[model samples]
Target: GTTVVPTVSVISPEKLSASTRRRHEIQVQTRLQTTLANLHQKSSEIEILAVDLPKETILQFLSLEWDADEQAFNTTVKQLLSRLPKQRYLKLVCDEIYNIKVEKKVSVLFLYSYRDDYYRILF
Candidate 1:
């Protein structure tokens, strides 16, 4: 057997109740319909297939209230890109990582688009 050179991390959680309530309030106010309402046109499964992201992650993207903080959203975009191989460098440039995040409603809508773009280019 080989030592796979394991990895580790540290984290914590508290104020769950307060955050949970906050989340509930937002969901109640917006709900998934907000996502649909913003979209001029779209579909579910095909978009998921395009992005290569887990359905739950896409749900979080649509459901959560992500402010248009450029750097913060850029960080997330980078994380998603990091999953792909170096050959995807050109695709990274072609895709608008920051543009999507800055536009809140369009962010969720185009998220499905751009993520799909990445997967399409990858293959």
Candidate 2:
């Protein structure tokens, strides 16, 4: 696995016009979904670390949409991600978008990378 800055919109939707924002919302929703799909395929090739993982997890993680229904998306991941050093968590972001597992407390993704490997086996 390789590292990356967790995908985030560089620009805020408020900066755009009403029309542009709507389309951007659609764009973000689809883009993040596609990103997770691609990453899920990529993660399958490698082992996971601090994996702390399981079911429909990608669905839960991708619940993050660009301007998505606030209720529709979960704040769980976004909030967890925000607490980490952006660069550190991003390390294997691309490698394991599917690494996220959900619970009432906290859920985080961990990927395996040859360069700077990070792991966990919380069952």
Candidate 3:
């Protein structure tokens, strides 16, 4: 038998609760710290996949602004990215990660920012 690994996609900051976001940030930081602590280091590349939530949900959760200095949302995201050991794993496990019906209505929004590094998906 073979193990099956699901494809992970990076979720938007607004899609997660404050605590979850913080936990993820810490987890990434710890991983990076551990990697650097090891004497033998290997270079790697990380692929960032963005998962876009509904526009209305995002607006309501993030207050329509994803990059607010006071909110520290953007900073947290950057920290998480920087901590990854040249690679990242982000998965949207619908059944395990999120147990929600896909039939629900969704308001999708497309963000356009050339300076930032992120991606989005709509299902």
Candidate 4:
């Protein structure tokens, strides 16, 4: 419900050919991505000063599965982190959060040495 839908203004769009429409679509997408990427560069999800985020928002990153060998990571998390300033307390928190998540999933994610992560499997 909090998502924003961007509206693009077009002029005499049907008057344009199919090729023109396709070109226009690509142009719009490029513009949109450029704008969003710029915005992301200026923002920090962990810092999140402009909006009110609940405490549980941190839990949105991940939790765990009971099975030691079954592993997982939030795929969208990489996308969420694709652009942004990598500095400050926010960065530390997010990095630690990711590290903890990966730590929880490490048993199955890596082939094993003395310890693949902080969590060691005795088997």
lDDT of 1 by residue, 1-123 (tens): 322222222223644466676665555545445444444432231212235454444443442233434555656556654654554642453244333333422323344434434322110
**Per-candidate RMSD vs. true structure?**
15.3, 15.1, 18.9, 17.5
lDDT of 1: 0.40
What is the TM-score (0 to 1) of candidate 3? 0.21
Indicate whether candidate 1 or candidate 4 has the larger TM-score. 1
Give the true-structure RMSD of model 3.
Answer: 18.9
Clashes of each: 2, 3, 5, 0
Q: Which has the higher TM-score value, candidate number 3 or candidate number 4?
A: 4
**Model 1 regions more than 4 Å off:** 1-66, 89-94, 103-123
lDDT of each: 0.40, 0.40, 0.34, 0.37
Error of 1 at 84 (Å): 1.9
Off by over 4 Å in 4: 1-9, 43-123
Please write out the lDDT profile of model 2 over residues 1-123, one tens digit for every residue: 433335444377457777777787666766567444444332223234433323333223333432333333345446545645464544344224333332211233333334434343321
